[PDB]
Subunit: 497 residues, 3 copies
């Protein structure tokens, strides 16, 4: 029989066709989805995880191959001469870097294989000399000459740059649960943080002064999932950054007394430490887990933060501000616990629409409520009630912590990720629960047997989800057995983590 | 009987009165709406379209009249002497422009009527010498001395600056469908782009260095309708713009090798081309129409973009990034097609509340479903289901394209106009559909004849809409017959377009 | 029986415990809320209002106490020597201020007790000489040497910096209605504006050039409650600020002809006036009250604004722009009045779910509809219908005024706080009303007696609200009797205001 596309075609007078043939499809109505070319993904879900081939740039050790049309073995100077014409800005950047200009070097004492690096570090030194065997580097290259910074970059725990891709892309439910082309940006954002040294001081200038600015962090550290850029920007610190950025001296090292206005790097890469996670009190899954950072057991961490603030403030003032965070965070969890009780209550009474068996299976292949143990908390392919629940804990409750940590008066109270947004979300959740309960009570009284709509279970997008494909023995548990990396507590991990 | 205002008056003790009399109305409850003074609008709907008189500044050829109290015929120097006192910044701007200062001229070779312009171009040269017959210019004036830039500015197709007002204000459903004072900003934003030469390099400095900055575009190129500023700003390019803006040389022409960080103008006004639309692969109604820009038939356009990126990147890298766009866009349309099926399904089963006959007529004067052929897709004066549908296609699906085109990792996936926002909107749409279906099933079983509420059809705002006033013969179809401008495919156009 | 925490504990294997003991609680599920240490709040609700002890910094006259561990009586030079080590940036700021550096003084003629201040104004001059009796100042200190600026800062009416905390924190429903730690940022934002002189030109540099920038206002003047920063930033003025900030001369006094680009301070602190409220036509509760500022009775104010704009524009142009504001504002109230009729209609027909007696009492201790006289308009602890109503009047209708006042073409029409957001909110409100009415009609026909869910009335957060604690005689009406400050028209004020 006719598909949606077939019917649309008959009404609009545009033939059905493949999405990728170049036709301009009116409202995309008569286009058929085609699977892009994929490569196999890595990690514990390698049996079905895919990536677009462009993963070559971000996990080059496992995916990089020669794809150049230019042949020859060249000297550094020859790289520069041709690329001056062919990719001019790369050469301009490099000429303005310490690698390509001795005049701006600071005599740091850089060594390779125990010997001082006194020459230019040219294109060929990083990419190789043979244009048919060019190399696309990771931090492994930089380690040859910058071992201190690399060791620190590799010193973080789960939730740090160190494992952002290897663990928190390849094991993450929201990534593995979706078609590869939908989440390319997830792989790359997290992979840039882990595998590269250019997330903060970009190629090819590699300028530490650039890395000190909030712009070195905010492309990644933003949004409803983790809104720390907005929290910082809407603090007095952030306003002063905007006011002073144009005329302040960004060439000064991150040190006590060198800056009036603190930035992300100042507070988190203290004294140039390339393991920024380590200053945090404790990893809390972005504030979705509740912890009082002002409790006696965390005194050393709290005192360390107070001393950091004391670069520019009374320590009594700083202590008071961090206590406001503790108090505000603890109040915020009362609203989440209210939400959770309402939501789980609906599931236990069997009034959620759809119920889990009425939806597509989750990415484990289970028909399991998303906000119970063993489920997959999410915002997609689930009930409205479960969506709103996820929004409450992740987008709002987590960000209340971020608002307090960064001194955003407005976002603690009124704004995005605030107390008052929590209030409004709680009203939304209760509203959904109330509607569900009223429908169920009416249907019971009149003897109407409600069946959840088929659109909760099947559709052009829902039919693409990996939950449909899951089968016994499709998990690489040897990956989860690894002890050289941490792991996520996934329901199908199959082993101790 | 008493109106809302009358009842409110009796409860609050504030008399009913006209909104425009200067009274401070408590929550605006007892104020009566008054129609502002209008002038007639232009275009195919001129029989009922209105504008506020302030349209004089933006379509001066058709609306400008003398409104000055100052009399005299003056020389350029006299304009300057008096306006130094009367409008100081205009004079300061002009004195800092090439028009008013020979010292900053570049010897471009500007001519008027075949003769070199060697004098100052003063207030009177652009506005006239008689203060009771002052002129308010458009690009027609600038063409006298800058024919190349003007020709390019006038070379675009539908969806470009060239027809932004003449076609895409005067023929646009959302503009013609609303009271004039509600949409003044629409007329002016679109009219500034079309009729003026000051949208990017503002009067009275007319500084190209200003026009090269993203600030020259983002006042217009923003928001949930078309969020390209945010997409750019949340890319690494955008972060580098913020980092480098204060110290970079904006005086350099937009040319390969002159910039490290690309801006809107760099990529879209390539080499100073004043027809920025022409570099686009194809006009797609802001990404609401699906097209694979990586398909064989679009190879020339794709290769041109790759070469643009190659100013600062490997062309293989650029090609991969643009393929990610193609793939991400194609996946995004699966969710829209799901949404559309759910929404139209509800209409075909007769369970939408209100149904079209329960709402105010659309701007054509029809009681027609908004998301069917011949309807008016919209976010106002319609059902919640239809609102959510419009939000899905315009605000979200269109912006997924914008997120990929501009390399915003976060907004492709998590953020505003992203895949995950599409997911959440799809849950909202299914939720509305499910509620509608459950109500209809209950009402059928118990024999309750539901009538949609009167507030869907009538109210103080809804009663102002032009749909109520539409009648046969009220369209100027001669306008649509014009072949010197393109046209929108409006349901009542009455002729071939 | 088991609480939510007890049940969660049994399912997750984490013991129940107090939120403040430092345990990392999985999704905060097994943590019990503990009341933070409070101090008593001031104002008419002092019988139950609380503050966190950190209020010491913001209302120091009533809460400041010695909390230093350092003992001694010191000379100014000694303060500097030690704090160079102990709080370096404070000293660096002070050394770069006129107080601490004669070289940057302008010979203003500053006097204390009728005598010229010719020495440095050091740490001890502002904080005292005894480290166990240090002072935390307000504007009262600054008045000793800057009486003109202080008098103006203290000259505003309700809705100005002058009474931001004393009246609009201590008397405000949303503040007094919530646990103290939830609204700390409210107290501090409003208290910084009232009690300090560092909101715009921050300590310890106290630089007027900093205060002239929009960054001096936007930390407070932002968001869905009052979005003037975004309105300004998305105007051409705001784009030009961003374009010119890095290279423009911010050292010039706010005067006609000194600036190309107007900022908040330029337009509102005209010629350096420290009572910025006074230039407004009339206080309108942030545009929630409707007034036509172009009406004959407001001509003097309108003419004054036109003349301000004429620093850089034709006064005819300016007049037209302010008339667009008047017209756009008046149209916006038609949609609010529609919303209000729908919402109140539902209450009068008894179909709101919950009805007021089904919710927790409001902060007065009443079970009263929030959008009727005597009620408490709010977004929390109320029905979805009432939430949406508050969002319509405060977040949207109020901000339409802000969008027009600040020349944001996009936000007048499409964007945040716009006409089209009003449209969408109106659809949401009608949708809620329609659902409520359909449920009520079904339940009546089948004889089902609906009881609103218990979660509308009780829960871990709702149980903390002050409405439960209210009792006769708990209002300090002597506060409301004061005539030296204005007051809010609270339902339980008990006296004439
Ligand atoms: C040895 C062969 C090197 C390799 C491999 C990499 N870099 Fe390097 N780096 C090298 C030298 C000789 C210098 C100059 C030292 C001096 O005396 O000044 C640098 C400098 C840097 C810097 C600081 C730049 C600045 O302007 O202050 C950075 C941030 C940097 N290098 C980064 C970096 C990265 C990310 C690398 C891997 C891709 C990398 N370097 C490789 C020598 C060598
Ligand atoms: C000092 C004044 C800071 C600046 C500037 C920025 N942040 Fe921050 N951050 C700061 C504190 C005191 C905390 C709480 C840590 C604690 O244990 O008490 C945080 C928190 C974060 C986090 C979460 C870290 C964690 O949970 O362990 C992140 C990811 C973070 N901050 C990032 C971040 C960014 C991107 C910033 C610039 C935009 C930024 N911070 C500014 C202190 C300070
Ligand atoms: C952001 C999180 C960064 C990442 C990821 C990496 N670097 Fe970095 N780097 C960053 C900052 C903010 C600074 C300045 C710090 C300061 O003390 O002011 C730097 C500096 C460097 C340097 C210069 C060191 C010196 O002696 O002057 C080098 C050589 C360097 N960074 C290298 C480097 C490498 C090899 C990285 C990957 C492993 C790397 N950086 C990542 C910010 C960030
Ligand atoms: C008057 C002109 C002052 C001089 C001189 C100094 N300070 Fe100050 N300080 C002043 C005020 C009005 C305030 C209150 C906060 C506000 O913004 O109004 C403060 C605050 C402090 C604080 C606490 C706040 C903090 O950021 O930690 C400290 C620790 C402080 N001041 C110390 C200090 C020192 C060491 C000074 C000399 C170098 C100094 N202040 C000068 C006003 C004035
Ligand atoms: C002839 C009578 C002119 C008319 C009419 C307009 N302009 Fe012009 N323009 C004119 C001259 C003689 C020059 C200087 C040329 C030189 O040799 O440098 C210019 C310059 C400009 C520029 C570039 C300014 C810069 O600083 O680089 C711009 C952007 C410009 N003019 C814009 C412009 C517009 C928008 C006009 C219509 C309103 C317009 N010009 C009229 C001469 C004449
Ligand atoms: C180069 C690095 C770019 C910069 C900087 C900006 N944009 Fe862009 N844009 C770019 C590409 C490769 C595309 C896709 C075009 C294609 O056919 O593949 C776009 C798209 C747009 C569009 C839509 C154009 C169309 O559909 O034909 C608009 C309106 C647009 N971009 C505007 C825009 C603005 C305002 C920017 C600065 C904020 C901006 N772009 C940056 C490339 C680049
Ligand atoms: C934004 C979309 C623009 C509009 C609309 C107009 N101009 Fe423009 N102009 C713009 C930029 C980004 C630049 C610099 C381009 C570059 O190559 O770097 C310019 C430049 C000019 C110039 C100077 C040309 C020269 O030879 O140096 C002129 C004379 C000029 N622009 C005129 C002009 C006119 C007449 C316009 C209306 C028809 C117009 N511009 C619109 C950006 C934009
Ligand atoms: C080591 C210090 C490097 C030197 C010297 C040069 N490049 Fe490089 N480049 C380097 C890294 C680590 C990467 C991977 C991306 C990242 O940010 O980590 C790259 C990338 C490239 C690319 C592809 C990416 C792109 O933007 O197109 C190209 C085409 C490239 N590099 C070329 C290049 C040339 C011509 C150089 C000499 C002028 C050069 N690189 C220097 C590290 C280093
Ligand atoms: C007298 C003992 C003072 C007290 C108390 C405060 N300030 Fe002051 N201030 C004082 C002097 C002698 C000067 C320099 C005057 C001159 O001739 O230039 C100032 C200056 C300022 C300024 C302007 C600074 C500038 O760089 O232009 C500001 C904004 C200022 N002072 C603010 C200020 C505040 C907020 C105070 C209370 C906390 C305060 N001053 C106290 C003398 C005295
Ligand atoms: C001049 C060009 C202005 C700039 C720059 C900013 N604002 Fe403004 N504001 C301006 C006008 C003409 C009005 C309307 C006043 C009237 O009576 O017609 C306003 C309004 C406000 C308000 C409300 C004031 C009131 O209701 O009385 C506020 C709080 C406000 N503006 C603040 C503000 C801020 C924070 C700005 C920078 C971000 C800003 N304004 C810019 C004129 C101008
Ligand atoms: C923002 C709303 C401000 C607040 C609150 C206070 N001040 Fe201010 N101040 C502000 C600006 C924008 C300026 C520059 C104004 C101009 O004309 O350009 C100033 C300036 C001062 C000065 C210098 C006066 C002089 O003669 O040069 C002083 C002494 C000053 N301000 C003091 C002061 C005091 C005592 C305040 C609290 C009562 C105060 N300011 C608050 C902005 C703002
Ligand atoms: C041509 C190159 C011009 C010269 C020389 C001057 N102005 Fe102008 N002005 C010009 C245009 C094309 C416009 C229309 C608006 C637009 O952006 O296209 C204007 C506008 C004005 C206005 C009204 C708008 C306003 O901001 O109030 C006035 C009052 C005005 N111009 C005055 C003026 C004076 C006094 C001049 C000499 C110093 C002057 N203009 C020069 C184009 C040109």
């Amino acid at each position: 029989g006719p598909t949606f596309q077939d019917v649309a075609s008959q009404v609009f007078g545009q033939p059905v066709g493949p999405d990728n043939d170049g036709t301009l499809y009116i409202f995309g109505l008569t286009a058929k989805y085609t699977e892009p070319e994929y490569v196999d993904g890595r990690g514990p879900y390698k049996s079905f995880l895919k990536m677009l081939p462009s993963i070559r740039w971000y996990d080059p050790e496992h995916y990089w191959t020669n794809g150049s049309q230019t042949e020859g073995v060249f000297k550094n100077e020859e790289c520069v001469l041709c690329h001056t014409v062919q990719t001019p800005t790369i050469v301009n950047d490099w000429k303005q870097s310490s690698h390509g200009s001795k005049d701006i070097r600071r005599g740091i004492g850089i060594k390779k294989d125990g010997k001082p690096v006194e020459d230019l570090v040219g294109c060929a030194d990083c990419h190789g000399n043979n244009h048919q065997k060019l190399e696309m580097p990771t931090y492994k290259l930089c380690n040859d000459c910058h071992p201190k910074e690399t060791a620190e970059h590799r010193a973080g725990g789960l939730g740090s740059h160190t494992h952002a891709y290897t663990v928190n892309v390849l094991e993450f439910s929201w990534h593995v649960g979706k078609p590869a082309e939908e989440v390319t940006g997830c792989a790359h954002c997290h992979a840039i943080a882990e595998n590269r040294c250019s997330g903060c001081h970009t190629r090819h200038k590699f300028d530490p002064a650039e890395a000190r600015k909030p712009t070195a962090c905010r492309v990644c550290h933003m949004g409803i999932d983790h809104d720390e850029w907005a929290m910082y920007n809407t603090s007095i610190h952030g306003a002063l950054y905007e006011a002073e950025s144009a005329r302040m001296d960004w060439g000064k090292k991150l040190k006590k007394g060198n800056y009036r206005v603190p930035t992300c790097a100042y507070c988190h890469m203290q004294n140039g430490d390339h393991n920024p996670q380590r200053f945090g009190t404790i990893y809390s899954d972005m504030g979705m887990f509740q912890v009082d950072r002002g409790a006696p057991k965390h005194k050393a961490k709290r005192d360390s933060w107070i001393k950091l603030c004391q670069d520019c403030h009374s320590p009594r003032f700083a202590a008071d501000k961090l206590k406001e965070m503790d108090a505000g965070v603890n109040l915020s969890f009362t609203k989440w616990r209210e939400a959770a009780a309402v939501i789980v209550g609906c599931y236990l009474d069997g009034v959620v629409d759809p119920m889990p068996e009425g939806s597509a299976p989750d990415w484990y292949g289970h028909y399991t409520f998303s906000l119970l143990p063993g489920g997959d908390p999410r915002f997609y392919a689930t009930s409205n009630l479960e969506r709103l629940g996820l929004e409450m804990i992740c987008y709002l409750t987590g960000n209340v912590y971020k608002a307090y940590a960064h001194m955003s008066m407005y976002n603690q109270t009124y704004g995005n990720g605030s107390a008052f947004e929590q209030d409004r979300k709680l009203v939304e959740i209760k509203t959904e629960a109330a509607k569900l309960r009223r429908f169920a009570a009416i249907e019971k009284k009149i003897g109407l047997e409600h069946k959840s709509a088929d659109f909760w279970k099947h559709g052009e997008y829902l039919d693409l989800l990996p939950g449909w494909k899951r089968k016994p023995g499709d998990v690489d548990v040897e990956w989860f057995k690894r002890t050289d990396i941490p792991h996520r507590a996934n329901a199908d991990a199959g082993v101790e983590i």
